[PDB]
Amino acid sequence: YELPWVEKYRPVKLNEIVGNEDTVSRLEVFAREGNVPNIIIAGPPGTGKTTSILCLARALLGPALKDAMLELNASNDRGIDVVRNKIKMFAQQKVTLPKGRHKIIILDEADSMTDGAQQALRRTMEIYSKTTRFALACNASDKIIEPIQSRCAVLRYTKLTDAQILTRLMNVIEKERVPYTDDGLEAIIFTAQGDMRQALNNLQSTFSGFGFINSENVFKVCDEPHPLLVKEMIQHCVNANIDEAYKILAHLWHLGYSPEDIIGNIFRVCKTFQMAEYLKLEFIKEIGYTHMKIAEGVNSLLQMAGLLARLCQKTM
Amino acid sequence: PVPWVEKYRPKCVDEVAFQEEVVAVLKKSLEGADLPNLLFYGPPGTGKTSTILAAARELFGPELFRLRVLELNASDERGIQVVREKVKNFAQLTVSGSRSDGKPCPPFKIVILDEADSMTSAAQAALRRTMEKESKTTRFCLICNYVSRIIEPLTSRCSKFRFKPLSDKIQQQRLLDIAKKENVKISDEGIAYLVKVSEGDLRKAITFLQSATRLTGGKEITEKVITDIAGVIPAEKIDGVFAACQSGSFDKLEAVVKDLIDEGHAATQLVNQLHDVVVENNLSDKQKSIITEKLAEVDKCLADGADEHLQLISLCATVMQQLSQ
Amino acid sequence: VDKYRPCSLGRLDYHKEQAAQLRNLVQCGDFPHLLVYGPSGAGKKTRIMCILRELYGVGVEKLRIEHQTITTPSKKKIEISTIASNYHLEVNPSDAGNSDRVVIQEMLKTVAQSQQLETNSQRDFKVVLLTEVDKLTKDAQHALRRTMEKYMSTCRLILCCNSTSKVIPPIRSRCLAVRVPAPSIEDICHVLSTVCKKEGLNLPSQLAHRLAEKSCRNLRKALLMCEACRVQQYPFTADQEIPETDWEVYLRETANAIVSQQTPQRLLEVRGRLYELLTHCIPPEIIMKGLLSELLHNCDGQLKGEVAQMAAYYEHRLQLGSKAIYHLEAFVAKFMALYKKFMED
Amino acid sequence: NPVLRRPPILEDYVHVTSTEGVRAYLVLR
Amino acid sequence: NLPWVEKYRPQTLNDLISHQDILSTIQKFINEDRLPHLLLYGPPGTGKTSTILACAKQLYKDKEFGSMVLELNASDDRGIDIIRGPILSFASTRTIFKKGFKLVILDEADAMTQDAQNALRRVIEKFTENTRFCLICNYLSKIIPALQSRCTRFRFGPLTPELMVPRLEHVVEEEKVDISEDGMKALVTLSSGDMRRALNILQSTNMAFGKVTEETVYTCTGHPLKSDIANILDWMLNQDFTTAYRNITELKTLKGLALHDILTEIHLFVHRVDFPSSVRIHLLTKMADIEYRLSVGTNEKIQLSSLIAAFQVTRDLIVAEA
Ligand SMILES: Nc1ncnc2c1ncn2[C@@H]1O[C@H](COP(=O)(O)OP(=O)(O)OP(O)(O)=S)[C@@H](O)[C@H]1O
Ligand SMILES: Nc1ncnc2c1ncn2[C@@H]1O[C@H](COP(=O)(O)OP(=O)(O)OP(O)(O)=S)[C@@H](O)[C@H]1O
Ligand SMILES: Nc1ncnc2c1ncn2[C@@H]1O[C@H](COP(=O)(O)OP(=O)(O)OP(O)(O)=S)[C@@H](O)[C@H]1O
Ligand SMILES: Nc1ncnc2c1ncn2[C@@H]1O[C@H](COP(=O)(O)OP(=O)(O)O)[C@@H](O)[C@H]1O
Ligand SMILES: [Mg+2]
Ligand SMILES: [Mg+2]
Ligand SMILES: [Mg+2]
């Protein structure tokens, strides 16, 4: 009954968080200032928006965490009745706390609520501001209304950078004593696509599967279109060649891949290709046009062949 | 409520002319009482829907026609959920094969899918899965324009029945028979032009003759009412367009394009009739190729929703570029 | 233009044979679903009015305004201003940007499953007059086709539209297509002479011909121009300053500013002018049409043809996106690059 | 190279003419 | 009696083929009681449901299979009421049976929305030690990366014909029907690497005619013939425009072909025809455009004429290069 590495090696203090730089320093200042405002934390999913406010609350309250901390996810019911009852009930309780300490009501996924829930959340945040401090973890901050974010601080989280994911992955590798190769690290970066929990889950999956880290073992348990072949397809499209590129496309089509998977790996390789800048921008525009065709409902091999022909036609 | 395309459906399978081989195979399949495989396909107006309805009437009778026959339009119901719920709701009703008139009725309910080739591959995969759900109590019959649009698994559990297009002599014969039956005054040239504007379609010809009887109101049906109900652009306009593009400047092109637009003529009819003219005459292969590719792009832009006048002036610019060189 | 509209098909001035066909259609039973189309201002609403007059008694001219409340899939009550009567119901479903399918389902249900009150006066069916069906989405027109299939018995529709290429063929094939052309210059001059002579005016034939040629065969524009020319100066001369609409001459000045200079600061100024045109709520199709006409009036050396193709292409792009200013500025930027290339060499 | 006027006698081929009819052939291999 | 797929469904980890690394890893995880939430994704009919049913009948007996396995499929709509309905209440309960985890087989998991997949992500992460989910789907890219980041995925690829033909030989030895070489080539080509359609086509060819040859499969299925598309390409490449248009429209109204199937078979044909690169690029761009123009729902004769137009420009360029 071993725990997965997603929750086993979650950090327990703000010094171990590698994602942001200014926001984690703001949280470190807030953890000792004791006058924490209501905050809204915005960013992509999986960048650590709820293992940061959790670490702030655990460093703030400390031993009184179990009585003066309420995490409300979207796992439970997301109606107006539960937010009316449970949040007000928890805010009305008393906890014997120090001078610079307040209760914390984390609201994970605060963007799925309606306008009535947030316009009542205005008054719940305004009235009980002495007793408790709110922390709304939102996926998109534009869906948060202006009077909510006027009275509360806004904190921004970016997508994990590949150097930060490299540092975290090598820390986990040194912790678990995993033998590794640099090609396997590049493969787990490529299959990670910037998400930290995805990176840790793929690393623990290939460690439980095969053990030693190499670039061939990563794609046996994930089985994306191989970036060597997709990079060869892009290189053949940029070198004025259509027959060899369609040979690679038919090789990756008789392995049964969907058009969406191949064109997603095509764009992910063409992000980090090496060519001219204007050629990159024209290629990304053509790939986006073809992906609009495919997501519209045209998912034939002929559309991928036409994409290859258009990419070969852009480069003279 | 007089739907002449439904009123003149032959309700008996012996009344179905020109298709006596398919009629005989259908009669053998009905008398065999074990029919897992059924499919009808062909051009529109060939009466495949009327043939399968005549088979359902000669087997089930009028009493079970409203009970065990369910007709669904696939193009009207392209969503997954509706054809999941309605087919299952009809199939879950257990109705025995006992008839009050004493005729032996085999125990199945028949399902008609009109225009089943309009579905995508995933919709037909879910449809097949529903076929494997209910392959016992009810039976299915798909009607499509082309058999090659139907995905493989639905061709496994069906037997194809191809339909030839009806020859124009029996088209004119049926049109004059219906006009004599309903006392419609129309000459042989009017019948010939009516079957000309409705290219291989008896449904369109029947609806256009019904509309001609509505719009004339007892008068003799002329060529103008026929060419106006179908929306057919007259050949004088096409000849003027090609005369402007052959020897003229863009003032002449804008004049004829503004004349066609302010006459109210649709751009889809213009691209269709200009394609019909430009695919038969004595232009070069390169000129016909460039003009037809431009016509296809223009009809795509009109299907997207682009403004028709700009498409027509660009099309006439392309035709002028190819012709006046 | 509203006081002296002909009330019946026998009082029409042009398109007599189509009036005869439509009154023969009314003269018998089973009146089918109509699809009335043509160019704008041709007289489609006049023909549909005369059809509704012939379809019933004299009470068709009674009209009333209702504000019906629709509910979307989201819990949102939206008001729709319907022009209704006791014999028909005229609606514009294009005002709902995404809830057009809901209103054309609900109005069809409340007009079909709610039976008629006094079936002795009207017939067994009542008419729903959809207006401007071309800008409806494809799934909305599919829902319209489904509701037309379900309720053929008590609700037979008349669809007034223009440029039928936006309308899907599965709903076009079920409807009798009636095409009302724009009247000819001689017929516009004849109805101008009639509308002048029945109010004591002395309009000459030359000014009437100039009004007909200037209005681009739009009859409502060619009659409001006549009334504005009466108000502007009553003694009618052959050389009169015809009152021009402001956005048309603004588009002409816009094209003059385009052909004046091919610098990106002039592109910023013309972006401001295009933004003024857009914020004046005129559609970008009419803007592209007027811009192309005024640029082809000021072009030479066959370049017009290439420009013509260019205009259509960007209008196509304007029908795929939502922000029309990107496509309009792309069109004028490509046109200014092409002129600079043409005038430089 | 990809267009041959003479027929290939060891593989399949597809004929291709024009308005004048020179009758070239294309390899199906 | 019964269809052949429901008769000869595999019931053993060795009876499923070409997934030997996946089945070996599943057996390795299930002998050591370390099986995670599974996400089996791939083409239809490649052995997704039968693999996890074999693993369920390995784990559980016949008596407790109906109790500790809940199956949801395409008959159940997959929105937000289901994830807060039966599957949550199933996963959040214990059983009076032996101390093992439950199992939920969710067929067609790619049809769930992003909100539904996030709610399922909450349910999966909340209950792990007592419930092991199994989401099987066609497209991996239609689900969110968080759901991919919490459940172990496995790619059930297509079956290579070299490995596909022993099972077809076994089912043609067990069921005595007429077998030829071209019939087996038609089976392994038209079936497109999945055993379900191969067995269905084989049974339909047996029941319809009696013998299995190439033309019997082609007449029972309606697939476009190779000589048919060869005639279409010959008419496009060495005939006049009106002649080719009339010939191909008569063949379309006779053979029952459609322009999409003509387009994909011609696309498969033009990579065998040794064109120069530039006219290959022109043909591919034009044919992809015709495919999109047919996708948006236009008239068919004009797109047919555009296909002939592209091939007539092609034939002019080929003769001019000769
Ligand atoms: N900067 C980081 N440093 C260390 N671990 C991180 C970091 N960012 C993410 N993680 C890990 O990724 C997971 C964080 O997931 P969550 O924070 O729960 O998701 P989220 O980003 O908050 O988005 P929500 O809450 O679903 S809207 C944990 O397993 C963390 O260990
Ligand atoms: N063999 C036939 N014998 C007699 N009448 C026929 C025959 N075939 C067609 N018809 C007539 O043609 C009419 C049209 O029949 P339909 O079933 O609507 O044609 P269709 O093939 O179903 O085209 P659709 O419905 O648009 S796909 C029928 O009502 C008959 O009057
Ligand atoms: N590896 C295999 N070996 C032998 N027969 C197989 C194999 N895979 C599939 N089959 C056959 O094909 C049928 C379909 O298999 P299933 O796994 O039920 O379909 P599926 O893989 O789940 O794909 P779906 O359900 O259509 S999305 C089985 O019942 C077998 O008859
Ligand atoms: N027979 C006629 N006699 C007088 N005026 C007419 C006649 N037919 C049309 N008109 C005028 O032409 C104008 C066209 O308006 P309308 O019918 O709304 O066109 P559209 O429906 O295309 O916008 C109306 O203002 C009407 O007064
Ligand atoms: Mg989180
Ligand atoms: Mg039909
Ligand atoms: Mg399944």
Verify whether ligand 1 is closer than 6 Å to residue A286 (CB atom). no
For β-strands D13-16 and E102-107, DSSP reports them as unpaired
Sequence-separated (6 or more) residues with CB below 8 Å from residue C163: B266, B267, B307, B308, C37, C134
Buried b (16+ CB within 10 A) or exposed e, E78-94: beeebbbeebbebbeee
Q: Which domain holds residue C110?
A: 16-179
Please give the Cα distance from B84 to E76 (Å, whole number).
Answer: 10
Neighbours of E52 (CB within 10 A): 21
- Answer yes or no: CATH 1.20.1250.20 is held by domain E160-223: no
Same-domain check for residues C36 and C135: yes
Same domain, C175 and C267: no
Q: Please report, for the domain that includes residue C128, its CATH number.
A: 3.40.50.300
CA distance C90 to C81: 10
Query: Which residues in chain E are closer than 8 Å to B129, comparing Cβ atoms?
Result: 74
The DSSP-derived string for C25-43 is: HHHSS----EEEE-STTSS
Angle at C167 between CA C164 and CA C168, to 5 degrees: 130
Asked how this structure was determined, the answer is cryo-EM
Q: Identify whether the C-beta of residue B23 lies closer than 8 Å to the C-beta of residue B16.
A: yes
Total domains, chain C = 2
- Is residue E260 within 8 A of residue E292, CB to CB? The reply is no
A193: nearest Cα among A50, A23, A44, A295: A44
Q: Rounded distance, CA E320 to CA E322, Å?
A: 5
Residues with CB under 6 A from ligand 3: E 5, 8-10, 16-17, 44-50, 167, 195-196, 199
Domain membership of residue C69 (yes or no) is: yes
CATH code where residue C288 lies: 1.20.272.10
Is residue C59 domain-shared with residue C154, that is, in the same domain? yes
- Say how many residues make up chain B: 325
10 Å Cβ neighbour count for E107? 20
Tokens of E53: 């049913």
Say how far apart CA B295 and CA B268 lie, in whole Å: 10
| Domains of chain A with bracketed CATH | 1-160 (3.40.50.300), 161-224 (1.10.8.60), 225-316 (1.20.272.10)
Instruction: Determine the Cα–Cα distance for residues C50 and C23; give it in Å rounded to an integer.
Output: 9
Torsion of CA C240, C244, C248, C252, to 10 degrees: 40
**Straight-line distance from the first to the last Cα atom of chain C, in angstroms, rounded to the nearest whole number:** 51
User: How crowded is the C-beta side of B116, counted as CA atoms within 13 Å?
Assistant: 27
Q: Say if the Cβ atoms of A198 and E149 lie within 8 Å.
A: yes
Question: Quick one: C161 and C64 in the same domain?
Answer: yes
Residues of D in contact with B284 (CB under 8 A): 19
Q: Are C152 and C25 members of one domain? A: yes
- Is the CB of residue E109 less than 8 Å from the CB of residue E39? yes
Q: CA–CA separation, A256 vs E159, rounded Å?
A: 9
**A251 φ, ψ (degrees, to nearest 5):** -65, -40
Architecture of domain E224-314: Up-down Bundle (1.20)
Interface test with C, best of B202, B214, B311 (most C CBs within 10 A): B214
Which residue in the block uniquely carries the two structure tokens 């690290």? A185
State which H helix or E strand residue A106 sits in. Answer: strand A103-108
CA count, 13 A, side-chain hemisphere, A16: 14
E strands, chain C, where? 34-37, 64-71, 77-84, 88-91, 127-131, 158-160, 176-179
Q: Is D1 on the interface with B (CB under 8 A)?
A: no
Half-sphere exposure of C181 (CA within 13 A, CB side): 20
Phi, psi of E320 (to 5 degrees): -65, -35
C24 and C113: one domain? Answer: yes
Which of C133, C163, C179 is the C-terminal boundary of a domain?
Answer: C179
SS (H, E, C) B151-190: CHHHHHCCCCCECCCCCHHHHHHHHHHHHHHCCCCECHHH
For residue A306 and ligand 1, the question of a CB distance below 6 A is answered with no
* Crossing angle of helices A277-296 and E277-295, rounded to 10°: 40
Distance separating alpha carbons of residues C174 and C165, to the nearest angstrom: 15
Q: Does residue C251 share a domain with residue C156? A: no
Taking the Cβ of residue B34 and every Cβ of chain E, the question of whether any pair is shorter than 8 Å is answered with no
Burial class (CB in 10 A: 0-12, 13-18, 19+), C259: middle
Q: C34 and C140 share a domain?
A: yes
- Reading the block at residue C268, the tokens are 């910023």
Q: What is the C-alpha to C-alpha distance for residues A245 and E302, in angstroms, rounded to an integer?
A: 31
Choosing from E14, E160, E196, E201 the residue with most ligand 3 atoms within 8 A of its CB, the one to mutate for a pocket test is E196
Determine the Cα–Cα distance for residues A210 and C120; give it in Å rounded to an integer: 85
- The three-point CA angle B98-B100-B103 to 5° equals 65
Phi first, then psi, for residue A153 (nearest 5°) are -75, 150
Classify residue E32 as exposed, middle or buried by CB count within 10 Å of its CB (0-12, 13-18, 19+). exposed
Quick one: DSSP state of residue C234? S
Strands E152-155 and E131-137: unpaired
Which residue among C179, C208, C223 closes a domain?
A: C179
Looking at residue D4, what DSSP letter applies? B
User: A45 in contact with E at a CB cutoff of 8 Å?
Assistant: yes
d(Cα C132, Cα C142) in Å, to the nearest integer?
A: 16
Among C152, C179, C206, identify where a domain stops.
C179
What whole-number distance in Å separates Cα of residue A280 and Cα of residue A234? Answer: 11
A191 vs A178: CA distance, rounded Å: 18
For residue D18, which residues of chain B lie inside 8 Å, CB to CB?
285
Instruction: State residue E71 phi and psi, 5-degree precision.
Output: -110, 125
Report chain D's C-alpha Rg in angstroms: 9
CA E159, A309, D27: angle at the middle one, nearest 5? 75
Per CATH, the number for E1-159 is 3.40.50.300
Distance from the Cα of B284 to chain D's closest Cα (Å) equals 8
**Partner residue facing B126 (CB), from E74, E220, E299:** E74
Whether residue C257 sits in one domain with residue C174: no
**What residues does each domain of chain E span?**
1-159, 160-223, 224-314
C268 and C167 in a common domain: no
CB atoms within 10 A of CB E233: 21
Does any CB of chain B come closer than 8 Å to the CB of residue C165? yes
Residues C222, C226, C229, CA angle at the centre, nearest 5°?
135
Helices (H) and strands (E) in chain D, counts: 0, 2
C-alpha C251/C-alpha C263 separation (Å) is: 19
String of b and e for C167-190 (b: at least 16 CB within 10 Å)?
bbebbbebbbbbbbbbbebebbbb
Same domain, C134 and C259: no
Using the beta-carbon criterion (under 8 Å), do E245 and B84 form an inter-chain contact? no
What single-letter amino acid sits at C153? Answer: S
DSSP per-residue string spanning E128-168:
-SSEEEEEEES-GGGS-HHHHHHSEEEE--PPPHHHHHHHH
Q: Give yes or no for a contact between A170 and A205, defined as CB atoms under 8 angstroms apart.
A: no
Residues of C in contact with B74 (CB under 8 A): none
Residues 6+ away with beta carbon under 8 Å from A176: A207
Q: Which residues pair with A40 in a beta bridge?
A: A136, A154
Please judge whether B229 and C177 are an interchain contact, meaning their C-beta atoms are less than 8 angstroms apart.
yes
Residue C160 inside a domain? The answer is yes
CA distance B186 to C339: 58
Cα C8 from Cα B102, distance rounded (Å): 60
Give the amino acid at E309: A
User: Measured between alpha carbons, how far is A161 from A168 in angstroms, rounded to an integer?
Assistant: 11
What is the total residue count of chain A? 316
Cα within 13 Å of Cα(C144), Cβ side: 29
> What sections of chain E are H helices per DSSP?
4-7, 20-31, 49-59, 86-91, 114-126, 145-150, 161-174, 181-190, 195-208, 214-221, 226-237, 241-255, 259-269, 277-295, 300-321
β-strand C88-91 against C77-84: which pairing, if any? antiparallel
The H or E element spanning position E71 is strand E69-72
Q: Report the run of H or E that residue D25 belongs to, with start and end.
A: strand D24-27
The protein residue with its alpha carbon nearest to ligand 3, atom 2, reads E16
